[PDB]
């Protein structure tokens, strides 16, 4: 609602003192989503109490479901971490296996050719790298 | 005292208001407070989970990319085999592979050294 | 007849202050119940969001598996065919084996640093 709020949170309602009723408006904790509503008698007081229990009953029920979906998540998470560990391992394996094939191909398809310049430039770049880690 | 049995119209009511007042006095908030705690607890579990989810989502994109780069590299090998001896001198891709390979090596131990120091500083 | 009225009128001077106590605490408890539903609702939607992200990861992870399965199926015939196969041919073999070894080393180093960090973030 927009204006209509203002059009019915004034004046007071069901015999409420205009002064106490005005005190509820300012003591309102969330006027964005709430209005002062008079509750008269121990009956409305119990009615509200029982509503709380019904909703808390519903509240707790969601949390149990949600709790359920966390355990699933947590376990889903652990599986996911596991598959990551494998697939990195496989990749490391396959990667090295490809480098072995390319190497065998290079030696073969260059059979009986002079050692060649750019090939000797690797040697150096490779020898310096082996030394840099020893 | 003729129709003054309206004292009975002020007896039954007082109790009604008294026996509810006792009903209010019986109710507590303990359950409503579990709900309050449980929410803060599940937020905490969800948060650690979602944190780790982002950690290894990064791990997964890095992995997907690399698997794809390595799939390209195997296709180089297949291209080499297909190529006949008369067109091998035009097969420049294997050369690019190795040239790329050694600068990847140089870039790798530089990372690994960097990772080592970080891991030393993380221990002090 | 009349002195009784002094009882019930002293009970109401014992039940009024109860009412105000109760109404005060009702307005307090129902504030809690409102905070709850709000926080429950927020929790729930993040819970669904994270479910989604999880399933996205599951899909990417299936994709990766398929990619790697593709890569092996492509790689084994090459390995076999290349299996059914000199100063330059011997020197060149040293050069490219040196690369095979370096790659083997750097991958071990990588694998070891990862396992250390695995023992770390425990």
């Amino acid at each position, epitope marked *: 609602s927009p204006v209509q709020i203002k059009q019915l949170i004034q004046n007071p309602l069901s015999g409420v003192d205009p002064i106490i009723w005005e005190q509820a408006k300012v003591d309102n904790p969330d006027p964005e989503r709430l209005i002062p509503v008079p509750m008269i008698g121990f009956k409305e007081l119990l009615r509200r109490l029982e509503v709380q229990d019904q909703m808390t009953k519903q509240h707790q029920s969601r949390l149990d479901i949600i709790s359920e979906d966390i355990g699933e998540l947590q376990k889903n998470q652990t599986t996911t971490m596991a598959k990551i560990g494998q697939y990195k391992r496989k990749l490391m394996e396959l990667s090295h296996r490809v480098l072995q094939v390319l190497i065998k191909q290079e030696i073969q398809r260059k059979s009986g050719f002079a050692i060649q310049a750019e090939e000797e430039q690797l040697r150096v770049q490779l020898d310096t790298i082996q030394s840099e880690l020893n | 005292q003729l129709l003054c049995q309206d004292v009975e119209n002020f007896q039954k009511f007082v109790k009604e208001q008294k026996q509810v007042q006792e009903e209010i006095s019986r109710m507590s908030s303990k359950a409503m407070l579990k709900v309050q705690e449980d929410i803060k607890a599940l937020k905490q579990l969800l948060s650690v989970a979602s944190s780790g989810l982002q950690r290894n989502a990064l791990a997964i994109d890095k992995l997907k990319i690399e698997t794809a780069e390595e799939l390209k590299n195997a296709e180089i090998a297949l291209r080499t085999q297909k190529t006949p*001896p008369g067109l091998q001198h035009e097969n420049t891709a294997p050369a690019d592979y190795f040239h790329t390979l050694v600068q990847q090596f140089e870039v790798q131990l530089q990372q690994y050294r960097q990772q080592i120091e970080e891991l030393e500083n993380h221990l002090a | 007849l009349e002195n009784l009225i002094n009882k019930w009128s002293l009970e109401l001077e014992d039940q009024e202050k109860h009412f105000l106590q109760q109404a005060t605490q009702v307005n307090a408890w129902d504030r809690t119940l409102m905070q709850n539903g709000e926080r429950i609702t927020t929790l729930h939607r993040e819970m669904e969001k994270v479910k989604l992200d999880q399933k996205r990861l599951d899909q990417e992870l299936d994709f990766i598996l398929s990619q790697q399965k593709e890569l092996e199926d492509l790689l084994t015939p090459l390995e076999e*065919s290349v299996k059914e196969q000199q100063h330059a041919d011997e020197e060149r073999e040293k050069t490219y084996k040196l690369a095979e070894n370096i790659d083997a080393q750097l991958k071990r180093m990588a694998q070891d640093l990862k396992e250390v960090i695995e023992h770390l973030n425990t």
Partner: nanobody
Amino acid sequence: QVQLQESGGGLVQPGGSLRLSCAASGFTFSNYAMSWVRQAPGKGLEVVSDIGSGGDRITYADSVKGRFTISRDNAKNTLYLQMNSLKPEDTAVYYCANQYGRGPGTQVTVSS
């Protein structure tokens, strides 16, 4: 020792069709990738079609895309080439090959 022998070539009119074979021996054909290569007498070598060990990962030169089809029977160590909608410019020697060797060839002329 990669040993290859092709055939099925001949002389045909423009628009004609032909089906070439390449018999493989001396190597475990099913594990190798194969190519069809051609050379006209003045020009240089041109790969026209590729295929992988299992008959997947096929490719074609734009020249012949839509006109040629490559295939193989690993059980009979045989590589095929369907050639349709043939043109004078498709006139060449047709070799079957991979990096390890090639065959003698089979002449394909499309008259003009």
